Write a protein that binds this ligand. Structure first.
Ligand SMILES: NC[C@@H](CC[C@H](N)C(=O)O)C[C@H]1O[C@@H](n2cnc3c(N)ncnc32)[C@H](O)[C@@H]1O
Ligand SMILES: NC[C@@H](CC[C@H](N)C(=O)O)C[C@H]1O[C@@H](n2cnc3c(N)ncnc32)[C@H](O)[C@@H]1O
Lengths: 334, 334
């Protein structure tokens, strides 16, 4: 409820915009996607969903768009309008303060642009507002990004596991200043392992080819994203302990001229999204040739995020791990 | 509304652990309670905001007959588990709820609490601690008994320049084609509004500190809604005053012994560090000059304070006026 207030306050700070804008892979790929697909913009009507500082709307204008509606719900809207004026684009970019679910637009649009992707793609639940915005999209219209692929792969990383395990085991102490805390170990492990780990890693820690789950933004309905079910079956390529699942995502800007990809894969140049790892509370032993199967379930919550459920098992042994994660509250290990 | 987020934060075992592991903090509380055993032996105790229960366990180690441990977060349930597993059900009673809303079955001899935040007053929990005196027997004691806030002018060219280094990101005429320069002034203002949390060498301090004292035995809840701290500094060192540094001490004034808990820069580091409020316009002062003004802390709806600092060099008449948001500190400690 009031969780939404804090969400939009976060985006009101220029300090946050600076960090975002300094992701050169993010900013550069968006610009390339838009400019190299200029025919998708030339003399067209554009909607920018959550424009922030206005940067994507400026790209749209660079690509020759006739009119851009730049919708922003935080007080960043005021700073956007300052930039539109100072950059002499008042005749083309129209900042509209407010939520995209609530504002009126005078016109339907040829193309929607946005950066709705959060950590693990889904965090922030902005994909829903992005899909909601399709009420303004003409029949023959496009969305940038067009689709999104989430990848997941099993990883081995004892150092990470043991760091999180060691923190939780503070609550295994039997005489902390003479007090037995040990009755709370189970609660601590639950809590610490509930946090997804945001950082990057060497790809050599991945034990199988990634499973991918695609969302088509042209086709999906807002309601589809309330419950996201991702089944998986990994064919294990290396033997060892599986400490959890690594997550990343790519998005594609499928234009009339080119498809441009923005990847957050660990094989690609680093972005501010990094990668996301969900640890198992207890690792699963797998041998090469084994199959690790189960289900990643994402359930939309009232905190602009998802409750994550990961159930995984080594088919050959019946060894099973069940995990609950709180995507809203990641551990930023970088 | 932001009270809900406040209590959610303390519902995490990791946040409780953060404070428990502050050795200076937790060890000093234990030593103040145990070394003043006669203030506790066979006595009735109220622990305001018991969290994990750790201070209530210390009161039990010191021989208290009965300890009412009040906790408003869901941490109350975990504290209860610890009381059971430590076989202290007969002596420690966990009462879930806000100290302003629950009922106690009897009046107490002594109130213990750790309600300090940054610059002493952040989080406004001292209002709850003072509110709790409605449960205190006449001539009952409080641990801590008094609190001192210290302020002193500092010089720190590196810290000051940093603000411009960061804000100057906006001072560029073609960021991917966009003139960002019109936002530089707003970016500067933003950074100066955040109090800086980290530690420093005492050599940066330009004058003897002044102190503002709260006597918890005497103070009323309402006294903390507006805190006016006048200051006159007779300058020890010539230089540019880049702002005011803040720290605090509390004293536990027991029957046997007074024990001090200090967060001073001359003392070992605690989880509170120290806090510096910068001046966007610095003040030049020579040794022997007097730097006078007022630091006014005005309580706000976000469990924090709006900080207004006005300072002048009496000899030159040159002044600096500053507004900071204590709810949004910059954590600089690296
Ligand atoms: N993480 C990227 C960020 C900026 C991207 C931008 N393109 C930048 O680079 O500046 C998303 C933006 O979307 C806004 N936002 C989120 N939801 C909504 C909404 N429902 N209605 C309007 N704005 C929203 C939110 O306040 C934020 O400023
Ligand atoms: N300062 C940190 C901590 C000390 C923990 C422990 N004592 C430690 O020293 O380790 C304060 C505790 O007070 C609770 N709290 C804050 N306000 C209230 C209130 N009005 N009513 C009940 N609980 C409150 C709050 O949820 C938190 O658990």
């Amino acid at each position: 409820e009031s969780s939404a207030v804090q969400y939009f306050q976060f985006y009101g700070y220029l300090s946050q915009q600076q960090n975002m804008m300094q992701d050169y892979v993010r900013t550069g790929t968006y610009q390339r996607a838009i400019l190299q697909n200029h025919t998708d913009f030339k003399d067209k009507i554009v909607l920018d969903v959550g424009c922030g500082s206005g940067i994507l709307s400026f790209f749209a204008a660079q690509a020759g768009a006739r009119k851009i509606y730049a919708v922003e719900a935080s007080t960043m809207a005021q700073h956007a309008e300052v930039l539109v004026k100072s950059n002499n684009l008042t005749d083309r970019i129209v900042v509209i303060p407010g939520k995209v679910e609530e504002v009126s637009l005078p016109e339907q649009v040829d193309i929607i642009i946005s950066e709705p992707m959060g950590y693990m793609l889904f965090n922030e639940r902005m994909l829903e507002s992005y899909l909601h915005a399709k009420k303004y999209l003409k029949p023959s219209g496009n969305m940038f990004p067009t689709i999104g692929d989430v990848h997941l792969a099993p990883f081995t990383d004892e150092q990470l596991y043991m760091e999180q395990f060691t923190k939780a085991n503070f609550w295994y102490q039997p005489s902390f200043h003479g007090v037995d805390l040990s009755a709370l170990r189970g609660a601590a492990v639950d809590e610490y392992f509930r946090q997804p780990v945001v950082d990057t890693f060497d790809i050599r820690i991945l034990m199988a080819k990634s499973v991918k789950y695609t969302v088509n933004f042209l086709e999906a309905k807002e309601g589809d994203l309330h419950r996201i079910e991702i089944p998986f079956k990994f064919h294990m390529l290396h033997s060892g302990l599986v400490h959890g699942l690594a997550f990343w995502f790519d998005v594609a800007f499928i234009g009339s001229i080119m498809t441009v990809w923005l990847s957050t894969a660990p094989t690609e140049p680093l972005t501010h999204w990094y990668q996301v790892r969900c640890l198992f509370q207890s690792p699963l032993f797998a041998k090469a040739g084994d199959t690790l199967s189960g289900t990643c379930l994402l359930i939309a919550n009232k905190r602009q995020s998802y409750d994550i459920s990961i159930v995984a098992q080594v088919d050959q042994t019946g060894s099973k791990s069940s995990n609950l994660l709180d995507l809203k509250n990641p551990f930023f290990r970088y």
